Amino acid sequence: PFPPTPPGEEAPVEDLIRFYNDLQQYLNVV
């Protein structure tokens, strides 16, 4: 499934960087 949930537009851009970090784990996590 997809554990990480994308941030809203109001969420700080830093959240987007973390999302990419968590998304990277998804690929390695498979």
Do 4 and 15 form a contact (C-beta atoms < 8 A)? no
Query: Tokens standing for 5?
Result: 């949930």
User: Please, what's the largest Cα pairwise distance for the chain?
Assistant: 29
CB atoms within 10 A of CB 22: 14
Q: What does the alpha-carbon distance between residue 5 and residue 30 come to, in Å, rounded to a whole number? A: 16
DSSP the chain: -----PPPSSS-HHHHHHHHHHHHHHHHH-
- Give the integer Cα–Cα distance in Å for 10 and 12: 6
Closest CA to 22 of 1, 10, 9: 1
Cβ–Cβ under 8 Å, residues 26 and 4: yes
d(CA 26, CA 5): 12
Dist CA 20 CA 14 (whole Å): 10
